[PDB]
């Protein structure tokens, strides 16, 4: 038995987000939902169809019929952001549990934030271990979706950048970090090194050097 | 009413571990049990599920004459026996009780199959005040006194930012900070 989902619902704060979860007759199925949000554990946000457990807020609702079932968050807030699971259990067969893939729900249109950077050279202790680690490191942005351009004297590097995709904090909005792995040489030979963010089409500029 | 995993960590492929969940708060022996997992980025995976009074056992199909699920009602502990471990397995696993609906959820443990050795954490302080922790394997670093971890040649590296301590299952490391 298969439960698709659609992969991606974004919607702004205040309006209606609708997850589906289509299946072959699934309105004669009893379906349940699971709310995820990133680090934590599951959490049981709709059993049965429409039913809430003890907790969850009324403006989580669903509903099942013929081979969609829906689940509906009214007034979306910024915390609602997870991914959301479709489940139904089936009993006399030999994989009761069947999972949707999954549905990440993502809410636009929250407040605006330049990202504050900060950049570390490498550390008199990590020059003394034959390493060069370049630290940059971006906090408190939204939306969380940046790219970095790593900039030697005045020049682009693609060679030793190790970047991470952002992550949300608990005040909701993002932090990444990015590496800049060079020989201790590479580092005392050119003039700077900059780690220029660029956030919604805006440059947050910050330049570092050995001397 | 809680659910803790533990038994999570290194392995080889081919290798073998078991997983333990210790439940507290509710009547142990009165509720089905299952175990979940979720690979890195991915969606949630039913794996196994004993059943209460009666203990029928189920499996998936991508588990099965290799994983075995059992109980402790005694010591109100669920065991999940994993053998003959594969790439396809690593993942983060999660306990929870109930049938039909599973109500009840663990923060989880992971599971890293991989072929590189394990490795602690190395500090470096940093100043411009930051941390930074390099060189550990698997990615289970915490930081006391936040930013995630980044994947360089097979391991891993983390930055802190405010003494600086971290948490690792090779061995918890201290630094000095200016």
């Known amino acids: 038995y298969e439960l698709t989902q659609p992969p991606s619902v974004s919607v702004a704060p205040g309006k209606t987000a609708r997850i589906t979860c289509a299946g072959n007759?699934?309105?004669?199925?009893?379906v349940h939902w699971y709310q995820q949000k990133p680090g934590q554990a599951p959490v049981l946000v709709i059993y049965?169809?429409?039913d809430r457990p003890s907790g969850i807020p009324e403006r989580f609702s669903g509903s099942n019929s013929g081979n969609t079932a829906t689940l509906t968050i009214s007034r979306v807030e910024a915390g609602d952001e997870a991914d959301y699971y479709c489940?139904?259990?089936?009993?006399?067969?030999?994989?009761?549990?069947?999972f949707g893939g999954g549905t990440k729900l993502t809410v636009l249109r929250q407040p605006k934030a330049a990202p504050s950077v900060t950049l570390f050279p490498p550390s008199s202790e990590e020059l003394q271990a034959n390493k060069a680690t370049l630290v940059c490191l971006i906090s408190d942005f939204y939306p969380g979706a940046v790219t970095v351009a790593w900039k030697a004297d005045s020049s682009p590097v693609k060679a030793g950048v190790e970047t991470t995709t952002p992550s949300k904090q608990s005040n909701n909005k993002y932090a990444a970090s990015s590496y800049l792995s060079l020989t201790p040489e590479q580092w005392k030979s050119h003039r700077s090194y900059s780690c220029q963010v660029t956030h919604e089409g805006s440059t947050v500029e910050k330049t570092v050097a050995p001397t | 009413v809680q659910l803790v995993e533990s038994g999570g960590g290194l392995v080889k492929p081919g290798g073998s571990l078991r997983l333990s969940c210790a439940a507290s708060?509710?009547?142990?022996?009165?509720?089905?049990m299952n175990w979940v997992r979720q690979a890195p980025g991915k969606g949630l995976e039913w794996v196994s599920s004993?059943?209460?009074?009666?203990?029928?056992?189920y499996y998936a199909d991508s588990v099965k004459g290799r994983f075995t699920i059992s109980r402790d009602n005694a010591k109100n502990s669920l065991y999940l026996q994993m053998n003959s471990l594969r790439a396809e397995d690593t993942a983060l696993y999660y306990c929870?009780?109930?049938?039909?609906?599973?109500?009840?959820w663990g923060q989880g443990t992971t599971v890293t199959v991989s072929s590189d050795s394990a490795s602690a954490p190395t500090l470096f302080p940093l100043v411009s005040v930051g941390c930074l922790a390099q060189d550990f394997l698997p990615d289970s670093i915490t930081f006391s006194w936040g930013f995630p971890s980044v994947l360089r040649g097979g391991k891993y590296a983390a930055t802190s930012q405010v003494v600086c301590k971290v948490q690792h299952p090779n061995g918890n490391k201290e630094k000095n900070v200016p």
């Open positions: 708060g509710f009547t142990f022996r009165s509720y089905s």
């Open positions: 004993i059943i209460s009074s009666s203990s029928y056992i």
């Open positions: 489940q139904v259990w089936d009993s006399g067969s030999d994989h009761p549990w069947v």
């Open positions: 929870a009780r109930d049938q039909n609906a599973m109500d009840v």
């Open positions: 007759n699934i309105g004669s199925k009893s």
């Open positions: 049965y169809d429409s």
